[PDB]
Ligand binder design. Structure first.
Ligand SMILES: [Zn+2]
Ligand SMILES: [Zn+2]
Ligand SMILES: [Zn+2]
Ligand SMILES: [Zn+2]
Ligand SMILES: [Zn+2]
Ligand SMILES: [Zn+2]
Ligand SMILES: [Zn+2]
Ligand SMILES: [Zn+2]
Ligand SMILES: [Zn+2]
Ligand SMILES: [Zn+2]
Lengths: 7, 7, 7, 7, 7, 7, 7, 7, 7, 7
């Protein structure tokens, strides 16, 4: 699984 | 599974 | 599964 | 499954 | 698993 | 799937 | 999947 | 997956 | 996955 | 995964 999060 | 989130 | 979310 | 969401 | 988070 | 959005 | 967004 | 976002 | 973000 | 962010 992979996540990229820009917030 | 993969997620890209820009918020 | 994959998600791209721009918010 | 795949989703692209621009909001 | 991998995560990249910019906040 | 692909999206181009100019707003 | 790919997205280009200019806002 | 790939995203380009200019905001 | 890859993201380019200019904000 | 890779991210380029200019803010
Ligand atoms: Zn996994
Ligand atoms: Zn999975
Ligand atoms: Zn799946
Ligand atoms: Zn499915
Ligand atoms: Zn893992
Ligand atoms: Zn598709
Ligand atoms: Zn795809
Ligand atoms: Zn992908
Ligand atoms: Zn990837
Ligand atoms: Zn990766």
């Amino acid at each position: 699984d992979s996540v990229i999060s820009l917030s």
